[PDB]
């Protein structure tokens, strides 16, 4: 990959992200003052776990569908074989959704955009897993301290997905090459923007992996109990 190729790769990732970001950053920042009232929060807390799971599962289903579309518009992802495309999506799609959340997260008051307004994590009380939820909020909080640009979140989420270490890949060397190209493209774009300092501040790879382990576990328990 040349400099033209690395620059084209950056452009491709950023364009795909912009077209698949689901919620526009401008709309999310504008809505920060639109915050659930005490009555609306109590309204959520009184809902059954069943209904709350039904709303969350719908929210997550939609978010994952945009991530699938992100992958498919990515330079190189469609060049991979079907099996590998699926292995990567299966392992990474939800990890991308967790990362994507930080944009919809307001660190000033610790709220998230959910069903039209911002609310704290207490909104989700009826689900009965406050420790996992607070870890998700904590993760979003630490990411928001980096003030990710749109292009940065584009490149970073592309790297969460294009990971050659996922078990079950049939063309490991081809995924490696795509991964290496994205790592360099990311590093290069950060230097052009004087943002190299975020590299040392990025969460350790095991952090998102360990959070997604617990997450996918609880998700599957809700999936089966339904
Ligand atoms: C594919 C992956 C791993 C499952 C496996 O061990 O094979 C699983 C675990 C968490 C799952 C998701 C979560 O349970 C949340 C959603 C629940 C809905 O009932 C289906 C879509 C939904 C968006 C799920 C899609 C998919 O089955 C996920 C992403
Ligand atoms: C359950 C939901 C369908 C909702 C609907 O329209 O009724 C479907 C449609 C697209 C699905 C995803 C896509 O097919 C891509 C992935 C394919 C893998 O087989 C499972 C995980 C995977 C990440 C899927 C999870 C889930 O089952 C999704 C999100
Ligand atoms: C384990 C299941 C039952 O808990 C969730 O579903 C939680 C509520 N949840 C998430 O898990 C989530 C959000 C993004 C990725 O995962 C979520 C959050 Cl933390 C904020 C806004 C919207 C949602 Cl949907």
Curated annotation (Swiss-Prot):
What is the induction comment? Up-regulated in the state of obesity.
Where in the numbering of this chain does the NR LBD domain appear? 5-226
What are the subcellular locations of this protein? Nucleus
The record's account of tissue expression is: Isoform 1 is widely expressed in many tissues, including liver and adipose, and highly expressed in skeletal muscle. Isoform 2 is primarily expressed in immature thymocytes.
What cystine pairs are annotated? Answer: none
Recorded disease is: Immunodeficiency 42: An autosomal recessive primary immunodeficiency characterized by increased susceptibility to concomitant candidiasis and mycobacteriosis. Candidiasis is characterized by persistent and/or recurrent infections of the skin, nails and mucous membranes caused by organisms of the genus Candida. Mycobacteriosis is characterized by infections caused by moderately virulent mycobacterial species, such as Bacillus Calmette-Guerin (BCG) vaccine, environmental non-tuberculous mycobacteria, and by the more virulent Mycobacterium tuberculosis.
Complex formation: Interacts (via AF-2 motif) with the coactivator NCOA2 (via LXXLL motif). Interacts with the corepressor NCOR1. Interacts with CRY1. Interacts (via AF-2 motif) with the coactivators NCOA1 and PPARGC1A (via LXXLL motif). Interacts (via AF-2 motif) with PROX1. Interacts with FOXP3. Interacts with NR0B2.
Sequence similarity:
Belongs to the nuclear hormone receptor family. NR1 subfamily.
- Summary of the function given for this chain in its UniProt record: Nuclear receptor that binds DNA as a monomer to ROR response elements (RORE) containing a single core motif half-site 5'-AGGTCA-3' preceded by a short A-T-rich sequence. Key regulator of cellular differentiation, immunity, peripheral circadian rhythm as well as lipid, steroid, xenobiotics and glucose metabolism. Considered to have intrinsic transcriptional activity, have some natural ligands like oxysterols that act as agonists (25-hydroxycholesterol) or inverse agonists (7-oxygenated sterols), enhancing or repressing the transcriptional activity, respectively.
Q: Tell what the record comments on domains.
A: The AF-2 (activation function-2) motif is required for recruiting coregulators containing LXXLL motifs such as NCOA1 and NCOA2.
Q: What name goes with this protein?
A: Nuclear receptor ROR-gamma
Which residues of the complete protein appear here?
265 to 490 of 518
């Amino acid at each position: 990959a040349s400099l033209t190729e690395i620059e084209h790769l950056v452009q491709s990732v950023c364009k795909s992200y912009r077209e698949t970001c689901q919620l526009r950053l401008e709309d999310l920042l504008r809505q920060r003052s639109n915050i659930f009232s005490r009555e609306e929060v109590t309204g959520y807390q009184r809902k059954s776990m069943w209904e709350m799971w039904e709303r969350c599962a719908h929210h997550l289903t939609e978010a994952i569908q945009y991530v699938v579309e992100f992958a498919k518009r990515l330079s190189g992802f469609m060049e991979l074989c079907q099996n590998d495309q699926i292995v990567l999506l299966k392992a990474g799609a939800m990890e991308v959704v967790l990362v994507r959340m930080c944009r919809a997260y307001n660190a000033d008051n610790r709220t998230v955009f959910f069903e039209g307004k911002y609310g704290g994590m207490e909104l989700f009380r009826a689900l009965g897993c406050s420790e996992l939820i607070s870890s998700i909020f904590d993760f979003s909080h630490s990411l928001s301290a980096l003030h990710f640009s749109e292009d940065e979140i584009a490149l970073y989420t592309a790297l969460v997905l294009i990971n050659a270490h996922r078990p079950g890949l049939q063309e490991k060397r081809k995924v490696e090459q795509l991964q290496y190209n994205l790592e360099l493209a990311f590093h290069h774009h950060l230097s052009k923007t004087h943002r190299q300092s975020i590299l040392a501040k990025l969460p350790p790879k095991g952090k998102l992996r360990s959070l997604c382990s617990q997450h996918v576990e609880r998700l599957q328990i809700f999936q089966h109990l339904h």
